[PDB]
Design a protein around this ligand. Sequence first.
Ligand SMILES: [Mg+2]
Ligand SMILES: [Mg+2]
Ligand SMILES: [Zn+2]
Ligand SMILES: [Zn+2]
Ligand SMILES: [Zn+2]
Ligand SMILES: [Zn+2]
Lengths: 440, 440
Amino acid sequence: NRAAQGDITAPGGARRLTGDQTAALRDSLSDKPAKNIILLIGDGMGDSEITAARNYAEGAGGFFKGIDALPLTGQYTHYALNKKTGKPDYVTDSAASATAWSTGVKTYNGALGVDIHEKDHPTILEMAKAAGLATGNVSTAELQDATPAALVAHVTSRKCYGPSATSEKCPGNALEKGGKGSITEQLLNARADVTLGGGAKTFAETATAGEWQGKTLREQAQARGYQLVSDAASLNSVTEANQQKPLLGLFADGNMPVRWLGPKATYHGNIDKPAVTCTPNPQRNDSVPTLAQMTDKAIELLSKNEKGFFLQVEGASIDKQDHAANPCGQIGETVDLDEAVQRALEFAKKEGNTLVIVTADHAHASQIVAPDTKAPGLTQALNTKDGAVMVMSYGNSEEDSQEHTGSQLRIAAYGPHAANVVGLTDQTDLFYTMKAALGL
Amino acid sequence: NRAAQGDITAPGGARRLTGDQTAALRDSLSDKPAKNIILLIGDGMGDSEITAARNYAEGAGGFFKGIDALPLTGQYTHYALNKKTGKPDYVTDSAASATAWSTGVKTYNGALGVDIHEKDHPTILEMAKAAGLATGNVSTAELQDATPAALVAHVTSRKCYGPSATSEKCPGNALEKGGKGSITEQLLNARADVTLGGGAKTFAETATAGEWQGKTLREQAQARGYQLVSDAASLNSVTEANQQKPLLGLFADGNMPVRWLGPKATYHGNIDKPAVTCTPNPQRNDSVPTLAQMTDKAIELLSKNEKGFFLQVEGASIDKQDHAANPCGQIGETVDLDEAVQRALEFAKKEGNTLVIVTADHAHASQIVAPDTKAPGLTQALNTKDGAVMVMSYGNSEEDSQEHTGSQLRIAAYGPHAANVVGLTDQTDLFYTMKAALGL
Ligand SMILES: [Mg+2]
Ligand SMILES: [Mg+2]
Ligand SMILES: [Zn+2]
Ligand SMILES: [Zn+2]
Ligand SMILES: [Zn+2]
Ligand SMILES: [Zn+2]
């Protein structure tokens, strides 16, 4: 572990290390092939987000048993491009960044699986499937959202959820104009073995052309042999997932509900309002699977393939709650991701040939500031595990969405080929790292 | 080399890695002793600050030949303590943080070289000297400032620069009350072989007790055998520095001048004012030594000791210009630190037994944001090396000083014992890493 080893007020009591690390780090370095990869993404989970959640949930000297437990660490860059000039755009969205690690090419904000010239490039998930590996795509967001969509769809705008938006916003991609289709249509073609998340709403739309013209996208999925599930009990009862019977779990109309409840941050909230304690969200029913439960099921089903598997797992609402200036929502989604990381690491340590990677798509707004801060944006005081107040600040937007930031951020890894995240890297190096680890 | 491969618009063109890193990382791991340590601190140089400076000076896909070139990387925590309760204080100042890496014990904001019970703890510099090693203390700040002062002074408040302030603010430390004296008086007693920086102003004060009562602190230094220098020519002439003839360089009245000028960020500055291009500060001339020049001279003089040396080098005004909401000042001080890191790494690679560490004391205010941002704080657009606009935001204070933030941040190392910075560590682990590397 890397918790403080004793009394933080005494000499050495805040140390996270118990002895020299050179031998242990040598033991962590393997260049043998990866059989499997599990990539876990905390959307908007910069170093600031990791630290705030640790401080609140584990205490300043505590330790995330998942997120903090991966031994090989570095910092990576995630800048996008300006579509017209090809020059860097220093603050990416989720679409350009997910395109970078899934294809190895930089692109413009809002693009999925295409470059600045609108040309398609293959994804790591498509490549894994072509090599005979099992494939998984898990998220707490609607499945059409940028982070899961980038693995399975090639469209010129992330807004192209279904046929209706695609005809308006991506006419080159629209099925009735000869394109590959909307995000949801391309997801159904991609046919991952396991796809789990939200986003049932768009499946009520009808196709405009092709074999399933006039049928809903839900009807199409059923006709094409998918197993559709909608709650925890139906998910748990699934005993196989493969190309004959692929699994599609749709657990909410839009995004899945967050784990923790608290109030929104406000102007001078740390001064004028009481300190807050986060609580379990009553508007999340127990019939909704957790991220860790979805991860466990995916691992169980995918690991039956003896050649190997690729799995991406996204803690999507770290970012979404950071936009909403809601510390409890944001921290609870970080704690939720840590639970899923623990399931991945436990599997990987037993199996011995699995590369596990934990990172974020970009940095975000939240900052940890002094308790008496008088700031111009939105603030809130929180009562942490240590029995002390922490203040968080959201200071980069006068509009009601706090925005992404451009700082480089932590990437961490465990298992074969994990050395390739150490030092300064780029988000596009992660594509090449995964490709080489699996020998694709 | 970790610059982008080539055409960032093309597949693989933004990669920083040319191949697998496993073998090279194995070669980077040594548990042999360190003969020497060079610790470089960018005050306030969080991941955001590194990224902003790289984007501006080197381009998004560029590479700092010093800062980015250390192979072994992690993230460390720098929380302080509440003096009364002993619980964490999530946002440190410069005094508590410098006390943590130099002594191995956490303390309260504003403390130098003492714990929450006001007990003195020996510093890494005092320990190195006691073991017969040479010692250096270099900064672009006034030498009484917290970062250099923590190595050589034990006081209950960082405000205790000289006799006057100490009598008022630290009566227990005042020389005339039976204490050990002001920061400047304790620095003169500590007698490092090499001390270089600003802060001549306080040396005009006169002592209130002791052997040198009624003499200025400059006169005291002269009487105690110090070699006093004041400019680049007088520094370069120095041929030796040791306990018989210790070196004290005082190159400015207060802080040394910054390298680059630009205007302060303003409300809606990215919207209402044109983008800024930095320009050199006319106050810089060949008579004021640069941080890299001070670093090289220190290494030359300290390396005469055949047992070894400990050297701390501080890029102090990254933090000070971040407080002032001045991107050009902040960025130019980061470029300045990169030049000094290059000198340290060049020496260490030749010598082969030198541990070099680059990190920060705490994170800071500045954020990289989208060009069209409408923020409630202070903002500015900048024209970067790429020929594109970057916007920076300072959003955490309604007062004229933008404030520290609590996020964990990058620590990087090269040489013997460098494995001990990888993964999650605490700032107090850095004390123990340095102690064990030198076999103290
Ligand atoms: Mg996302
Ligand atoms: Mg300082
Ligand atoms: Zn995102
Ligand atoms: Zn976002
Ligand atoms: Zn500082
Ligand atoms: Zn400061």
